[PDB]
C-alpha cells in the first residue's frame, strides 16, 4: 500500500521499498526512457508523453 | 538489551533523520534552484519467535506463528524536483531554465556538475562563471570587452552589442542537460549535482528542442520549498519523537520494578 | 499521527494554490489579451467506515453512513475566455479579435502558437512579427519598403498605400484560429497557447466567417481580470488558510497534552 | 480495567469528530459542498449484580451531511451553472454508471460535449455545442441554446435534466464532488429542471460551500477540551493502579 | 517562501517599469521629434502540474 513510486534510469517503475510494480501483463512496468510528462490516471492507467 | 528498548530507539533515529531533513529545507528557503527533500520511512524486518529457528508462515494468527517487528528506518531522502517560481531581477547575467534542464559547470577536478542555479557572472578574463565559487560554465562563453549589452536567446545563443557595428554578433551558445531520473542525482552542495548510475546518461541538446527547456535571461528559479508544509511535518515528527521516548521510559520502569521488587 | 492534522494540511495546500492563482491574475492586470483563471476545488475520497444504505446489525438500512472525508485540493485551473475591453491606440500594427479567434505565430521550434495578444511590429525584412520575442505571424505578411501606410481589413486583408498608385496593393491575407475549448489550451507564457488533446482540432479560416471573429486595426484587447474580485478572493483565501492552521495548532496541543498525561 | 477502555472510546469518538470538523474547514471554498456533522451515541449498558447500569463509553455512529443550499457566487463564465433549489446534475462515470453532483463548474471537451471542469466526465444528457456558435445560453429549465451567426433565433442543441432524491444524505460521496445512489438515498427522480420540486438552472452562477466557519472553530473548542478530559481519567486510573501494586 | 510572494513581486516590478515609461513621455512632452513609448506586458511560464488534455 506504499505508493511512493519512482522511475529508475531504465524506466522500470518501483516504489519506495524497491519492489518492482506489476503491470497489465502481470509483469513489471517498463516505461520508455525519454519521458516528458507522467500523468497517472484515477483507475491506475499510466499516460506518458514521449 | 531488551528488544522493546531498541525497537523504540530505531523510531527515535528515524524521526531525528526526518528533523534534520526538515531543517535543511527551511535553511534553504531562499536558495535559487534548490529542490526540497523528504525523508522516506519503511519498517524493518519481522522475526518469527515461537517457531523453531527462523521458520515462518503457516499459522500467523496463532501463538506459534507470532511475528515481531524490528522498528522503522529512513530508507531514502527523495529530492522533489518540482519546478519553482521565477524571480524577475534586473541583473543581465543571471539566467533560468523553464522546464526540464540543468546548467553545466566545469568543476576544478575536471568533470562537469549539473546545476539549476543560474546566478552567473563574468570572471577576470570575461568567461561566464558562477557567482558563487566561480566554476566556469560549459560550453565556455567569452564576452568581448567592447560589448555593451549581453543578450541570451531562448535557445542559449549569446549575442553582444558592439558600438559601430549594426546587428548583434554571436559569441557562443549554451546547452542544457536533462536526465531520465533527476531524483537520482547526487547533491554535493553549492547548488551542484553529479551524475550517478541511478540517474542515467547526460542527454545534452539545444535548450528548446527535443523536450528541453528554454533559457530565460534576467530571471531566477526560486526554491520549491513549502515553509508551511515543513512546519506541519515538524509538528508530526516532534510528537512521534516524544511518543517513542514514552515507550523507552515505560520499559525501563518495568524492568526497574523487577530487579527491585523481585 | 492524527487524521485532523493531515486533513487540514490539504486545506492549507489547497489555499496556497488558490492564492497563487489569485496573485497571477492581479499581476496580469495590464497584460494585453490575458484571460483570468480560477482554481477548481473538490473533496478527496471518503473513507467508507459504514455503508450508507447498507444493512445494520439489526437489518435496518442506514439513512446516512459514517463516511470520513480526507480533505480538499485544487484539481484544475479554468481560464475564463470572455472578451475583454478594447483600447484605442494610434499604432497601425496592433490588432484585436472581436469574437472568438487566436492569432497564430511560428515558434522557434517550428510549431504554431496561438495568441490573443495583438501588439505586432516589423522586423528588418518587413515581415509582421510579435512585439515581444519577435516570432513571425502566420501567414507571413511582408510589408514593402515603398508603402506609406498600412490598412488591415475586417476580414484580415492587409493592404499598403503606395505613392504613384491608386487602388492600394494587397500584400497578404491574415487568418485566425478558433478552438471548441480554448480553456483546454496549454499556456506556455509570452501570451502564447499550445493546442492539446482536449483543446480540439484547430479550425482556421477567414476572420469573420464560420463563427470566427473580426480583426480590428489600431485597437488592443485589455485583460478581463476583475481587480475587486481578486481582492475579495484574497480576503477569503487568507481567512480559510488561517482557520486550517487553527486546527493543526489545536491538534498539536492535544497530542502534547496526551504525552504529558498518558 | 473497564475505566481505561471507557475513556478510550471517548478519546476515539472525539478524534473522529475533529476529523469531520477539519474536513468541513478544508472544504470552505469547494463549490457545491455540503457540510457534515458527527452523530454521537452512548454504547450499550450492562447489569453487573441484578439493577446497576454501567456504560461502555461513546462512539460516532454517522456523519450526517446537511444539504442546505449555500449562497450564490456570480461569475462571468457562460458554462458554470447553479441549481437554485433541490436537484443534482447527473454525470457519466467511466464505469458506465451515472454519478450525481451539485458542483456546476462545467466546460467543453474536444468534441464540444459538456463535461466537468475537473475529471472531465461527460454531463448527461449529452449537449454538443457546435463550432459555429458564438454564445451559449442556458435557460431556467435547462434549455441549452446557441447563437449562430447568419441565422436569426437561437437553435436548441439539447436540454439538461437534473435528479432529485428524497434523502440526499443517504448518498455515498466518492470524492470529486460526486455522489453514488445507495439503498437509503432513494429512487432517482429525473425530470425537467424546474418543475415538480426540481430546482432551476442558473447560468453563470455557482453554489458556494455552506460550512459555518465560526461553528467549526467553536466545535474545535469543545472537542479539544472533552478529548483532554478523557485523558485525565486514563491518567488517574494509571496512578490508582500504580499506587496499589506498589503499596501492597 | 510563498508562491504568491514571488508572483506579486513580478507584478510590482512590471508596474514600476510601466510607470517609468509613462513618466518619460510626460517629461518629454515638449521635445521636438520625440516618439512616445508603450510598455508591452506578457505573462511568464505556467508550471505544469496536471497536463491539459
Coordinates of C-alpha atoms in Angstrom, one line a residue, chain D residues 5-186:
Chain D
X5 CA -11.4 1.4 27.8
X6 CA -14.5 3.5 28.5
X7 CA -12.3 6.6 28.2
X8 CA -10.6 5.2 25.2
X9 CA -13.9 5.1 23.3
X10 CA -14.4 8.7 24.4
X11 CA -11.0 9.6 23.0
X12 CA -11.7 7.7 19.8
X13 CA -15.1 9.4 19.5
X14 CA -13.6 12.9 19.7
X15 CA -10.8 12.0 17.2
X16 CA -13.4 11.1 14.6
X17 CA -15.4 14.3 15.5
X18 CA -12.4 16.5 14.9
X19 CA -11.7 14.8 11.6
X20 CA -15.1 15.9 10.4
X21 CA -14.5 19.4 11.6
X22 CA -11.2 19.6 9.8
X23 CA -12.8 18.3 6.6
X24 CA -15.6 21.0 7.0
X25 CA -13.0 23.7 7.3
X26 CA -10.8 22.3 4.5
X27 CA -13.8 22.4 2.0
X28 CA -14.7 26.0 2.9
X29 CA -14.2 27.1 -0.7
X30 CA -15.3 24.0 -2.6
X31 CA -18.2 24.8 -4.9
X32 CA -21.3 22.8 -4.1
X33 CA -20.0 21.2 -0.9
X34 CA -22.4 20.2 1.9
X35 CA -21.0 20.3 5.4
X36 CA -21.4 17.2 7.7
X37 CA -21.7 16.9 11.5
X38 CA -20.8 13.9 13.6
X39 CA -23.6 12.0 15.4
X40 CA -22.7 10.7 18.9
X41 CA -24.5 8.0 20.8
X42 CA -23.7 6.1 24.0
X43 CA -22.8 2.4 23.9
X44 CA -24.7 -0.5 25.4
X45 CA -25.2 -0.7 29.2
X46 CA -24.7 -3.7 31.5
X47 CA -26.2 -5.0 34.7
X48 CA -23.4 -6.3 37.0
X49 CA -25.3 -7.6 40.0
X50 CA -29.1 -8.0 39.2
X51 CA -30.0 -3.2 38.7
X52 CA -26.7 -1.4 38.4
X53 CA -26.1 0.1 35.0
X54 CA -22.5 0.7 33.7
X55 CA -22.0 2.3 30.3
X56 CA -19.3 1.3 27.8
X57 CA -18.4 4.8 26.5
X58 CA -19.4 6.5 23.3
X59 CA -18.9 6.3 19.6
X60 CA -19.6 8.2 16.4
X61 CA -22.4 6.4 14.6
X62 CA -22.9 8.6 11.5
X63 CA -21.7 11.7 9.7
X64 CA -24.9 13.5 8.7
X65 CA -24.5 15.7 5.7
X66 CA -26.6 18.9 5.9
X67 CA -27.9 19.5 2.4
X68 CA -28.8 23.2 3.0
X69 CA -28.4 25.3 -0.1
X70 CA -25.4 27.6 0.0
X71 CA -25.0 31.2 -1.0
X72 CA -24.7 32.3 -4.6
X73 CA -21.5 33.3 -6.4
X74 CA -21.7 35.5 -9.5
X75 CA -19.3 34.6 -12.3
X76 CA -18.7 35.7 -15.9
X77 CA -18.1 32.3 -17.4
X78 CA -21.0 31.1 -19.5
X79 CA -20.6 27.3 -18.8
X80 CA -20.7 27.2 -14.9
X81 CA -24.2 26.9 -13.5
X82 CA -26.1 26.5 -10.3
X83 CA -29.3 24.7 -9.4
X84 CA -31.4 27.2 -7.4
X85 CA -33.3 24.6 -5.4
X86 CA -33.4 20.8 -5.0
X87 CA -31.6 18.7 -7.7
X88 CA -28.4 17.1 -8.8
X89 CA -26.5 17.4 -12.0
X90 CA -26.0 13.9 -13.5
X91 CA -22.6 12.9 -15.0
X92 CA -21.5 9.7 -16.7
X93 CA -18.8 7.9 -14.8
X94 CA -16.1 5.9 -16.6
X95 CA -17.6 2.7 -15.2
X96 CA -20.8 3.5 -17.1
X97 CA -23.0 4.2 -14.1
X98 CA -24.4 7.7 -13.7
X99 CA -23.0 9.9 -10.9
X100 CA -24.7 12.9 -9.4
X101 CA -23.1 16.2 -8.5
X102 CA -24.0 19.7 -7.2
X103 CA -20.8 21.4 -8.3
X104 CA -21.7 23.3 -11.5
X105 CA -18.2 24.2 -12.8
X106 CA -18.5 22.7 -16.3
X107 CA -16.7 23.1 -19.7
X108 CA -16.5 21.5 -23.1
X109 CA -14.3 18.7 -24.3
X110 CA -12.5 18.4 -27.7
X111 CA -15.7 17.5 -29.5
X112 CA -17.9 20.1 -27.8
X113 CA -19.7 17.8 -25.3
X114 CA -20.4 19.4 -22.0
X115 CA -18.1 17.9 -19.4
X116 CA -16.9 18.7 -15.8
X117 CA -14.0 21.1 -15.4
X118 CA -12.2 18.6 -13.2
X119 CA -12.0 14.9 -14.1
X120 CA -13.7 15.6 -17.4
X121 CA -16.7 13.3 -17.1
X122 CA -19.5 14.0 -19.6
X123 CA -22.7 15.6 -18.4
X124 CA -25.9 13.6 -19.0
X125 CA -27.8 14.2 -21.3
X126 CA -25.1 14.9 -23.8
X127 CA -25.1 18.5 -25.1
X128 CA -22.9 19.2 -28.1
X129 CA -22.0 22.9 -28.7
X130 CA -21.4 23.5 -32.5
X131 CA -18.2 25.1 -33.7
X132 CA -20.3 27.9 -35.3
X133 CA -21.7 29.0 -32.0
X134 CA -20.7 32.4 -30.7
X135 CA -22.6 32.4 -27.4
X136 CA -24.1 29.8 -25.1
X137 CA -27.4 30.4 -23.2
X138 CA -28.9 28.0 -20.6
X139 CA -32.5 28.7 -19.7
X140 CA -34.1 28.3 -16.3
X141 CA -35.4 24.9 -17.4
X142 CA -32.1 23.6 -18.8
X143 CA -32.8 24.6 -22.4
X144 CA -29.3 25.0 -23.9
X145 CA -29.3 27.2 -27.0
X146 CA -26.5 28.7 -29.1
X147 CA -26.4 31.9 -31.1
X148 CA -25.3 31.2 -34.7
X149 CA -24.2 34.0 -37.0
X150 CA -26.2 34.3 -40.2
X151 CA -29.3 32.8 -38.6
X152 CA -31.9 34.6 -36.6
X153 CA -33.1 32.9 -33.4
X154 CA -31.1 30.6 -31.2
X155 CA -31.2 26.9 -32.1
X156 CA -31.6 24.4 -29.3
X157 CA -28.8 21.8 -29.1
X158 CA -30.4 19.9 -26.2
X159 CA -31.9 20.2 -22.8
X160 CA -30.2 19.5 -19.4
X161 CA -32.0 17.4 -16.8
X162 CA -31.5 17.1 -13.1
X163 CA -32.4 14.4 -10.5
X164 CA -33.9 14.9 -7.0
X165 CA -33.6 12.5 -4.1
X166 CA -35.9 12.0 -1.1
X167 CA -32.9 11.7 1.2
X168 CA -29.7 13.4 -0.2
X169 CA -27.9 12.5 3.0
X170 CA -28.2 8.8 2.0
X171 CA -25.9 9.3 -1.0
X172 CA -22.4 7.9 -0.9
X173 CA -19.7 10.6 -1.5
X174 CA -16.9 9.2 -3.7
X175 CA -14.9 12.4 -4.0
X176 CA -14.7 14.9 -6.9
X177 CA -18.0 16.4 -5.7
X178 CA -19.7 13.2 -6.9
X179 CA -22.3 11.0 -5.3
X180 CA -23.4 7.5 -5.9
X181 CA -27.1 6.4 -5.3
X182 CA -27.5 4.0 -2.4
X183 CA -30.3 2.0 -0.8
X184 CA -31.2 4.7 1.7
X185 CA -30.6 7.6 -0.8
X186 CA -33.9 6.9 -2.5

